[PDB]
């Protein structure tokens, strides 16, 4: 789906499969967190479905020894003295010592400030212990979390329930057309994007000889040239668009190991899983009811949440019993208008936009004469069309698919390409669609705050600030203090400080809230990028002070208050909102749960040959399953006729479904239900 998803999938630790355990033989003790998983397996990143606890993610600094156990690094503390010597310990090796927490107050020489420090001990015991007892200590505060888990800013303010969902939904992000790096970061974005392997890093130092949208040539210092080719508009495993774009220009000195080009979900070498959106926290006319999300139409007009999606369609021409399937433009009883987008071979042409039902590959299959319906033979007689022994089996666009044809690949046995025995031709057509954000598309943040798009108002209906700039997204207030994910709030504050910038009062010394802050943080320009590492980073005392010294706009007045709120105007009436509202910038991701894929409907269609019931899934054009529990609802209502209708004529009944269609197209009444075919099958099986 995105580079982070691939990195995480490569760092998986699965307890399932041969040699491990069966899912039915797994109690609640194999799945829960073990105290030896510290710094080795993440206690956060794990699916919440039936594979919870059975699949973990390797910790960041963790590694594997040639025996098979997972080692984690620690700084060796001799006698209360922090040393730069680092040693990797296994699980049982860690228990033979006691290790101090990473966030320990340490002297510049290395001595612990407090005699008693928080120390972990065998059997998962946390307690205060003397400074002369600490043998080792953690490398980084984020030593326990995974790569995706370490990408959640202000993670220490989110409960594990929603943090798990944030980490798992970051993997579900969709690569947008253009990507923006988040204002509020953690530092992990860069290394995540680089180690994921979807960017283009320079192997050797040199200068850029020739840069194009197709390739980048690097002239090394010794004299050799290395050319990196860009992967442009390639279909991923899940239909997402993997598109790389050059970053450097002509004649740029680039060092070794530097990102010269970045691919999907990447901006200047950092994970760009979403966009920075102006968010206001307030209920708005009920359109944001319990996590429903209102969006500004700007995001539609400016392709902010627009993504490219590529689908692969495929069809083959084989050898049949009465001849051979041939791919041809000549299709029986089809106008020259439907075949207008086809070339002389019967293949859709490159660049032609195709809706659902359009022909992509025209294939005809010879059908025997002894296979004809009596009505069909009469109809062939009353139209005088002889020599139509072939029937239409062309490749058509499925329901819900629409886009531009971007590529065609043809393999022919005659062309010397090797096909499976019995095939004479094979055609793959790639169709690309440009999906804007729509009503119902599932958005989410990094703190497990998911929601579908409930309404996309016009840009003038949006609650706009004092200088007319309308907000981009309206998040409901009610769905905030329940989930215990205050990070999205804190981010929203820091985000705004990143959008405007700040200037700390240098006169009369450095204030008492910014004494711990680095000197680089005292001054910030608009649209500045910041890092909040997990279990470290910004404290509330510093964020509260940053809110007080926010940079003014171009007109010179400050929009938000020191409380982090600003006065909004109701764009529908004009009256200002009676109270200030928390307004900031939040990083919102477009998850791969779009209504363009999740919508489905069926009048009639294919039925499973054995049970004579409609197919399943959207891909097979099937219907919804009125399960066992739903019939109980029908019976509790007392709606007998509705239930009988669902069970026979609408589904199973062999002749009831046809006469129902006839009764509808004739205007007649619905006929009487018959006997289900599945019951006949049950009797014939009991026999």
């Amino acid at each position: 789906n995105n580079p982070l998803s691939g990195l995480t999938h490569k760092r998986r630790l699965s307890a399932l499969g041969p040699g491990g355990l069966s899912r039915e033989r797994a109690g609640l003790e194999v799945r829960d967190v073990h105290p030896s998983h510290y710094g080795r397996m993440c206690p956060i990143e794990t699916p919440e479905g039936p594979n919870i606890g059975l699949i973990g993610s390797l910790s960041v600094y963790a590694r594997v020894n040639p025996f098979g156990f997972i080692e984690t690094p620690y700084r060796k503390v001799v006698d209360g003295v922090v040393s730069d010597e680092i040693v990797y310990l296994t699980a049982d090796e860690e228990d033979r010592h006691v290790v101090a927490q990473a966030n320990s107050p340490i002297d510049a020489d290395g001595r612990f400030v407090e005699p008693r420090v928080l120390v972990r001990r065998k059997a998962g015991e946390v307690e205060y212990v003397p400074s002369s007892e600490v043998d080792y200590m953690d490398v980084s505060p984020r030593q326990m979390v995974s790569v995706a888990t370490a990408m959640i800013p202000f993670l220490e303010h989110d409960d594990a329930n929603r943090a798990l969902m944030g980490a798992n939904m970051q993997r579900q992000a969709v690569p947008l057309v253009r990507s923006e790096a988040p204002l509020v970061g953690t530092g992990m974005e860069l290394r995540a994007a680089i180690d994921a392997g979807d960017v283009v890093v320079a192997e050797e130092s040199g200068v850029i000889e020739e840069v194009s949208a197709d390739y980048i040539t690097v002239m090394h210092d010794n004299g050799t040239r290395r050319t990196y080719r860009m992967r442009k508009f390639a279909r991923s495993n899940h239909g997402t668009c993997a598109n790389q774009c050059p970053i450097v220009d002509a004649g740029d000195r680039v060092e070794a190991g530097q990102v010269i080009a970045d691919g999907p979900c990447t901006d200047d070498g950092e994970m760009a899983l979403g966009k920075n959106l102006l968010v206001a926290i307030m209920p708005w006319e009920g359109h944001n009811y319990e996590d429903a999300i209102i969006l500004s139409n700007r995001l539609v007009e400016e392709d902010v949440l627009t993504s490219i999606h590529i689908e692969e369609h495929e069809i083959d021409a084989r050898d049949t019993k009465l001849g051979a399937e041939e791919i041809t433009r000549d299709i029986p009883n089809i106008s020259d208008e439907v075949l207008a987008d086809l070339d002389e071979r019967g293949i859709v042409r490159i660049g032609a936009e195709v809706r659902d039902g359009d022909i992509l590959v025209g294939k005809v299959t010879p059908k025997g004469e002894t296979e004809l319906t009596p009505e069909e033979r009469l109809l062939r007689a009353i139209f005088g069309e002889k020599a139509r022994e072939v029937r239409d089996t062309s490749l058509k666009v499925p329901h819900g698919e629409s886009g531009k044809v971007i590529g065609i690949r043809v393999f022919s046995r005659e062309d010397e390409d090797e096909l499976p025995a019995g095939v004479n031709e094979l055609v793959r057509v790639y169709v690309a669609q440009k999906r804007k954000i729509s009503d119902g598309d599932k958005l989410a943040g990094r703190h497990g705050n998911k929601g579908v798009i409930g309404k996309i108002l016009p840009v003038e209906d949006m609650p706009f600030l004092a200088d007319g700039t309308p907000v981009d997204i309206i998040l409901n207030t009610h769905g905030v203090p329940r989930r215990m994910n205050i990070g999205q709030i804190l981010e929203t504050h820091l985000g705004w400080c990143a959008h405007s910038g700040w200037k700390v009062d240098a006169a009369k010394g450095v204030p008492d809230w910014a004494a711990r802050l680095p000197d680089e943080l005292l001054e910030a320009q608009p649209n500045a990028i910041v890092s909040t590492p997990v279990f470290d980073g910004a404290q509330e005392a510093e964020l509260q002070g940053l809110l007080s010294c926010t940079l003014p706009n171009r007109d010179g007045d400050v929009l938000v208050d020191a409380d982090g709120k600003a006065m909004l105007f109701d764009g529908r009436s004009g009256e200002p909102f009676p109270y200030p509202v928390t307004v900031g910038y939040m990083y919102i991701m477009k998850l791969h749960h779009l209504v363009d894929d999740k919508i489905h409907a069926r009048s009639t269609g294919p039925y499973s040959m054995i049970t004579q019931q409609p197919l399943g899934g959207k891909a097979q054009f099937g219907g919804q399953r009125f399960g066992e529990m739903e019939c109980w609802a029908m019976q509790a209502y007392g709606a007998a006729y509705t239930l009988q209708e669902l069970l026979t004529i609408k589904s199973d009944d062999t002749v009831g479904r046809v006469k129902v269609y006839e009764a509808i197209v004739k205007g007649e009444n619905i006929p009487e239900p018959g006997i289900p075919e599945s019951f006949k099958v049950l009797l014939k099986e009991l026999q």
């Binding site: 700084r75 790096a181 860069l190 680039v254 943080l521 990028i529 980073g537």
Partner: peptide, 23 residues
Amino acid sequence: SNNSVPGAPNRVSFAKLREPLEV
């Protein structure tokens, strides 16, 4: 600064704890 090794954009870290070992 944060991650001043490959030549990446300068993201400013709110970090009080130094990094003894890189990822």
